[PDB]
Design a protein around this ligand. Structure first.
Ligand SMILES: [Mg+2]
Ligand SMILES: [Mg+2]
Ligand SMILES: [Mg+2]
Ligand SMILES: [Mg+2]
Ligand SMILES: [Mg+2]
Ligand SMILES: [Mg+2]
Ligand SMILES: [Mg+2]
Ligand SMILES: [Mg+2]
Ligand SMILES: [Mg+2]
Ligand SMILES: [Mg+2]
Ligand code: NA
Ligand code: NA
Lengths: 725, 725
């Protein structure tokens, strides 16, 4: 059937990724010295990611076994699968970037043009994007085919009850396991890599620029290699796992909602249950987001393929925007026909929230897509120095450091309102068209072109690394200016991707609130009306107290991450000072600095600290649940969603703005004052403040929300009646 | 009756305030220079507060008229009354502090002991505390006696419906007007004063300390007078209006809840309304928080008098802590007998949430008190340099400025979890004992000794001013050390007071959620069960979207305040640079700097910016309500409560910790590095970052929550059915 043809699409995506890999590795590579340093970075990155992968997969096996014990084994299986998929996305991403980075450098060096570097960098990110979409939908469609069709978990869709008292739906619990795996792995990865790269970058930039008057990425600085290796580890793999888990999060959210919808919407007539919605419609609504995601992936492929070729323009940001726009538009247009034809005659839609026929989920999809796009636009507005706010931030450096920090935090706080409002109208309209299912599908719509988003976002770290390499070998300033252009653009794309992630996370979070309320239902209370189930009252003390708690947990989470960064950051600062002092000829370029120490500090600290956050995210709903019940947990999830929603956008836009303001002054756009000036130092301090926020605190929330909510959805059946207080 | 005797108590409080005023003003003024500078500061402060009071009272008259039009005239009357009360608290506070600071300075100069300065400063704050409690309970009891007893608005307590379709309860609407007045005035005052003092302080500290190597509060600096005048305007009057409005907020919250409880708790038996709770019980529960607050005031008076007459010890923090502890304890003990005797035989307790007899609200009160105290303890822990976190923050300055900022924000975020948890258990337990009424009374309990809290908190600005004056006139360093001690202590007390404020604000916010749900009921819908009324479903799209929006509004609010500060801050920085450049002999102490310009900048900017925030706080529930209904507004209130709860504590504790870390290094507690070193500059920058956060952003939230929630509670009856979408 056509099903197999759609099953080909992720495989074609993987093939495209491998093709781009081959195309980029084909590049001639700059210099033997460049190859050497790049090989060093490869060694460090591969090492750290190896230790990471080891520990995280150990923990993943443990958790998976625990799931197979306390739930269905299919849960643990899908868990391991998704784990492998996300981890593989990370590994492929890094292994690609580490080799891809040199090509950009040589391109900009020889051609002295932005075009080539832009192209190779874009292909570099493309590999990772296609890897993300491909892996996600591959694992997903594997779960779907194997567990849903062969085992017939989509067949029954009735409320079950295994031992220990957990009320579950087989397929729902399975995909729950999948998404949970993805979330845990993503969290571990990006926390570790995050702390690593941010400690390294903070120390390097701070001491190097402000305490030694060294240029950015100077080989005299023993911390620069740590910065680049960190860029390869954190800003890359973490992003892949992140947006993969966000994509999966949205789709699996839709699937769970749809699946739980069927056995619940019964009408109790004289002790007889009457299914108000037929099984066929439900199954169709279960398969719908998968085929959706496949089509979206395809369109993303069309867009990316169109871009990597094409007549290269002198403006990269415009090109990437064209990529996203074309991918999104194609996605919309094809989704129209997909939605119309697939859901043509089901008749049972009117009962479960469909207002305007069967074209409703396409409308909700459009809502999600347009929402994501607007988020991108706003993010770019607040972070790029081509506009007012970042220009003001950079220009404000004349007044001091305190002004940089203050106006930075202010910018962060102000930049919250537009995408949040966009999300509000998004939720309201999606709910208007197709209700909760509409919201769940809108979450997917925002990330329907996840491949292009991940690509455009991953385009940045390659540029940053290319700059780091360009500075180390003392090249023509054309290389540095081009690479700085690409790097600033990348910094914008990061903020954009973050916005997408947190938005989709929020829609999916609402849908997961719905599913969470559904999951509480036992086979005995199957007759209860849907309206009485979907009820999470704020005036209940446990619920609002829950919200407050969850909020505080999010904030303390952020604080813990920041502290974790500042530890190795400080230690490395002291290390840089000590090396600059005790090594003669180091600052004169007549003595090679000890990079391995700087590597060791952040590596050790990251490996040590990385454990706690994920464990907290997993155990919180458990302990709060067993202590105070399900309502309290619902509250916790709410507060978490809100506070995470705010802090993510804040940190993202603020950090991006700070960095791009630094790069703004570094481009000499501010008259008189330059790289060695005091305002430059102020913007540098600002950037070092924004670093642990934008690349460690921000996304960790968008993961934490989904993992915590899914854990809650799964475990709720236990402490719903087995709560202590 | 005994009622008149209790009505005497606030008058005795005012008398005590006047007595302390006379006692302190009798103290000797140091030197003609001190008198001159103090007269200057007095002139500036009185001027700014005059303009402020003028504009704010114009707006207040307008709003009051609007209330008299669209609601009962009693609403507008009580509005004006409360307005006058809060404003008067501010005016008295400032007018007292401005004179007290010299007494403190001269005391520390002559005696070279901590005791005297501590005592006179404490009496200085005492005047303001007694002014706050006194004014609040005076206006409140005036409303009670006049509108409740003479007019008989406590008599009817039936659901009414005036023109325009607003369903109201007379007394409830009245005290709503009262609290609203207090909130609007407090907001205006502390926003204006906040921006004023913070721009000045930021510029002064930054340029003075780090760019000129000048000592803090050096007369060579043209911005120091602006800083001191600001301390008198912002940190004083703003605090008075703030905590007065918080006190009033809690009490009026209880009153509104209790009042609305009667016509709502009817049982519909065959088209017949059956009051499940008698009127006597309801009225008793209405009077209860007032007499509660009166007793608390009395106990506060006992504590304060005990301290001011006590034998002065070399340790101030211990003395203030003893004050708070004794006040709280006395409050508890007397409240026990009050609660037992007053609520002896009411019969209606079992129906409306009272679990353990009639002693329940005393238990909830104890919960609130202990909660507030614990908040104080945690605040002191995180902010004082006598403990680990602030010490680490100060010591971290060796690693750079970015580390100071990062660890500061980290401290802020981490310090959120303990008092939030305290508030969670507080809410849960209060609800366990006496439900929503329990929570509402707990809000009062936390601030039962509001006089002592305001006193202890206001003790600080006087000390800070004493230090500024001592430095300006070039005195013995022992004076500076004493005043620095007292000032750091003051900085701790500030954080404590903020914690109290936001806590009480949150409890009262829950109770106001309840009252908000109550207010929607029309006379036709009077028969509806209480359980179905108290329902705010999160899964409703409007509600969660509301939460997101409100959250974003809180964040953008904070951002706007920060920006407003940074405007005049930057302008003043440029002014200081310009004066230092163009005025010869300025830095040599041979030319008097132009302070009036620095005054003018912050004055103009503050007067300009102060308008918007209050207007937003008032208009948001209106526009969002008319647009999307009552549920959406409920959501907005939720998100507002949560985000405000987090940001307030964050900014407060972070700012306090930063400041006391600066003071920690300035005391030479960090070996080797001193006032002129680079780590000192780092801590200075950190302090300038924390300044606009803790003294402009923080409390503004605790006001915004209550003003917005009250406005919503009042206006809800209109757009509940006259909503556009
Ligand atoms: Mg950097
Ligand atoms: Mg980097
Ligand atoms: Mg770099
Ligand atoms: Mg960057
Ligand atoms: Mg950085
Ligand atoms: Mg200061
Ligand atoms: Mg001050
Ligand atoms: Mg001062
Ligand atoms: Mg201070
Ligand atoms: Mg300050
Ligand atoms: Na994610
Ligand atoms: Na207040």
């Amino acid at each position: 059937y056509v099903a197999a043809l759609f099953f080909l699409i992720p495989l074609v995506a993987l093939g495209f990724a491998a093709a781009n890999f081959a195309a980029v590795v084909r590049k001639p590579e700059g210099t033997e010295r460049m190859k050497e340093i790049s090989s060093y970075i490869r060694s460090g990155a591969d090492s750290f990611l190896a230790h990471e992968t080891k520990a995280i997969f150990k923990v993943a096996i443990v958790i998976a076994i625990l799931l197979m014990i306390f739930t269905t084994w299919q849960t643990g299986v899908a868990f391991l699968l998704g784990a492998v998929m996300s981890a593989s996305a990370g590994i492929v991403g890094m292994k690609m970037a580490t080799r891809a980075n040199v090509r950009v450098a040589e391109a900009a060096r020889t051609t002295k043009k932005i075009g080539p570097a832009l192209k190779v960098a874009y292909q570099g990110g493309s590999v990772m994007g296609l890897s993300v979409g491909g892996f996600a939908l591959l694992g997903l469609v594997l779960v779907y085919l194997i567990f849903g069709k062969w085992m017939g978990q989509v067949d029954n869709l009735n409320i079950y009850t295994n031992w220990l008292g957990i009320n579950f739906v087989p397929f729902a619990m399975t995909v729950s396991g999948y998404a949970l795996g993805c979330s845990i792995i993503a969290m571990f990865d990006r926390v570790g890599g995050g702390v690593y790269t941010k400690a390294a970058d903070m120390a390097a930039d701070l001491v190097g620029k402000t305490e030694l008057n060294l240029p950015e990425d100077d080989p005299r600085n023993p911390a620069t290699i740590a910065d680049n290796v960190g860029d390869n580890v954190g800003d890359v793999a973490g992003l892949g796992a992140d947006l993969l888990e966000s994509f999966v999060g949205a789709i699996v959210s839709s699937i769970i909602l749809a699946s739980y919808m069927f056995p619940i919407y019964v009408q109790k007539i004289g002790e007889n249950l009457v299914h108000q919605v037929p099984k066929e419609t439900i199954q169709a609504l279960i398969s719908y987001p998968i085929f959706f995601a496949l089509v979206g992936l395809g369109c993303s492929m069309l867009g990316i393929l169109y871009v990597i070729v094409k007549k290269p323009s002198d403006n990269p940001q415009r090109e990437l925007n064209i990529s996203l726009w074309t991918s999104a538009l194609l996605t919309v247009v094809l989704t129209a026909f997909l939605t119309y034809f697939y859901l043509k005659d089901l008749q049972g839609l009117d009962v479960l929230g469909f207002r305007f026929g069967a074209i409703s989920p396409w409308f909700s999809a459009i809502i999600g897509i347009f929402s994501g796009i607007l988020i991108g636009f706003w993010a770019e507005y607040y972070t790029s120095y081509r506009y007012k706010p970042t220009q003001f931030l950079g220009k404000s450096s004349i007044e001091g450091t305190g002004m940089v920090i203050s106006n930075g935090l202010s910018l962060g706080m102000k930049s919250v309102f537009p995408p949040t409002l966009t999300l509000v109208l998004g939720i309201l309209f999606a709910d208007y068209f197709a209700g909760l299912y509409g919201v769940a599908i809108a979450a997917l719509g925002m990330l329907s072109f996840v491949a292009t988003s991940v690509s455009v976002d991953s385009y940045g770290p390659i540029a940053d690394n290319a700059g780091g390499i360009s500075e180390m070998c003392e090249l023509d300033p054309e290389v540095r200016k081009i690479t700085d252009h690409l790097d600033a653009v990348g910094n914008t794309t990061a903020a954009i991707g973050k916005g997408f992630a947190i938005g989709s996370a929020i829609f999916a979070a609402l849908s997961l609130f719905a599913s969470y309320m559904f999951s509480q239902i036992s086979p005995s209370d199957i007759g209860k009306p849907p309206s009485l189930v979907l009820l999470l009252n704020m005036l209940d003390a446990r619920v609002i107290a829950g919200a407050l708690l969850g909020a505080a947990i999010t904030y303390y989470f952020s604080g813990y991450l920041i502290s974790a960064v500042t530890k190795a950051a400080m230690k490395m600062v002291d290390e840089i000072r000590r090396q600059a002092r005790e090594i003669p000829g180091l600052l004169e370029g007549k003595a090679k600095p000890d990079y391995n120490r700087c590597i060791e500090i952040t590596s050790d600290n990251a490996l040590k600290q990385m454990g706690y956050p994920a464990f907290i995210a997993i155990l919180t709903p458990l302990v709060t649940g067993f202590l105070l019940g399900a309502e309290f947990v619902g509250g916790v999830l709410i507060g978490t969603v809100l506070s995470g929603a705010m802090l993510a956008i804040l940190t993202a836009n603020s950090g991006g703005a700070w960095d791009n303001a630094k790069k703004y002054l570094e481009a000499g756009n501010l008259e008189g004052y330059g790289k060695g000036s005091e305002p430059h130092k102020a913007l540098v301090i600002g950037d070092t403040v924004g670093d642990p926020l934008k690349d460690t605190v921000g996304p960790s929330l968008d993961i934490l929300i989904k993992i915590m909510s899914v854990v809650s959805v799964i475990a709720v059946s236990i402490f719903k009646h087995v709560h202590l207080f």
